[PDB]
Design a protein around this motif. Structure first.
Motif, mmCIF file in Angstrom:
data_model
loop_
_atom_site.group_PDB
_atom_site.id
_atom_site.type_symbol
_atom_site.label_atom_id
_atom_site.label_comp_id
_atom_site.label_asym_id
_atom_site.label_seq_id
_atom_site.Cartn_x
_atom_site.Cartn_y
_atom_site.Cartn_z
ATOM 1 N N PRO A 88 -1.702 10.933 -7.728
ATOM 2 C CA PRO A 88 -2.036 10.266 -6.488
ATOM 3 C C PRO A 88 -0.802 9.969 -5.707
ATOM 4 O O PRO A 88 0.281 9.861 -6.274
ATOM 5 C CB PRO A 88 -2.713 8.987 -6.957
ATOM 6 C CG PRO A 88 -2.052 8.704 -8.269
ATOM 7 C CD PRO A 88 -2.026 10.070 -8.887
ATOM 8 N N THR B 284 0.071 8.185 -1.471
ATOM 9 C CA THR B 284 -0.523 7.448 -0.371
ATOM 10 C C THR B 284 0.183 7.945 0.872
ATOM 11 O O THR B 284 1.407 8.089 0.874
ATOM 12 C CB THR B 284 -0.316 5.923 -0.536
ATOM 13 O OG1 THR B 284 -0.799 5.517 -1.826
ATOM 14 C CG2 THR B 284 -1.071 5.162 0.540
ATOM 15 N N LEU C 143 5.039 10.784 1.972
ATOM 16 C CA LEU C 143 4.140 10.090 1.047
ATOM 17 C C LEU C 143 4.831 9.083 0.119
ATOM 18 O O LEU C 143 6.037 9.162 -0.142
ATOM 19 C CB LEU C 143 3.403 11.112 0.163
ATOM 20 C CG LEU C 143 2.683 12.323 0.754
ATOM 21 C CD1 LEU C 143 2.197 13.206 -0.387
ATOM 22 C CD2 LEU C 143 1.525 11.862 1.628
ATOM 23 N N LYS D 160 -9.565 10.024 1.849
ATOM 24 C CA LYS D 160 -9.697 8.786 1.093
ATOM 25 C C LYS D 160 -8.684 8.870 -0.045
ATOM 26 O O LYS D 160 -8.168 7.860 -0.520
ATOM 27 C CB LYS D 160 -11.089 8.661 0.472
ATOM 28 C CG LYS D 160 -12.221 8.767 1.431
ATOM 29 C CD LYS D 160 -13.501 8.339 0.759
ATOM 30 C CE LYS D 160 -13.752 9.096 -0.511
ATOM 31 N NZ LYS D 160 -15.013 8.603 -1.124
ATOM 32 N N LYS D 161 -8.466 10.086 -0.525
ATOM 33 C CA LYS D 161 -7.534 10.301 -1.615
ATOM 34 C C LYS D 161 -6.583 11.450 -1.342
ATOM 35 O O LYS D 161 -6.998 12.542 -0.955
ATOM 36 C CB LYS D 161 -8.287 10.585 -2.911
ATOM 37 C CG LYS D 161 -9.105 9.435 -3.416
ATOM 38 C CD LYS D 161 -9.785 9.839 -4.690
ATOM 39 C CE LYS D 161 -10.900 8.885 -5.048
ATOM 40 N NZ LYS D 161 -11.650 9.416 -6.211
#
Length: 130
Positions: free
Chosen positions: A6, A8, A20, A59-60
């Protein structure tokens, strides 16, 4: 096997570069195997917008490093970026907004996949191929 991690979204720079938060620290990523038009080249603004839109509405966000070198001379991470499961690298190529770049230092896991999409986008005379 490659692993997704993940991230963001912080800021989308242009078509092939995204900023990111990865592992608690900001980092600039250069999308693997794609060459988008630089913003202002023909289609540069379109590739930028497409990438931006794709990562902002997600969203991800996930990053996936390949098996070769993970960063370039400028310190940019080299990865495949996924927005809600859809690979941005492939999405750009499929839409005729980028070309498949030459493999770099052993990072070629998804080269075939991207080559197929590029062929199809070319066959449909899409954007860059019109």
């Amino acid at each position: 096997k490659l692993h997704k991690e993940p991230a963001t979204l912080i800021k989308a720079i242009d078509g092939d570069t995204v900023k990111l938060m990865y592992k608690g620290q900001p980092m600039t990523f250069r999308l693997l195997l794609v060459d988008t038009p630089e913003t202002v080249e023909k289609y540069g603004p379109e590739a930028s917008a497409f990438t931006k839109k794709m990562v902002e509405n997600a969203k991800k966000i996930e990053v996936e490093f390949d098996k070769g070198q993970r960063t370039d001379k400028y310190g940019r991470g080299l990865a495949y970026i996924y927005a809600d499961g859809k690979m941005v690298n492939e999405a750009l190529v499929r839409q005729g907004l980028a070309k498949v770049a030459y493999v770099y230092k052993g990072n070629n896991t998804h080269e075939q996949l991207l080559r197929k999409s590029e062929a199809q986008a070319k066959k449909e005379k899409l954007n860059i191929w019109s």
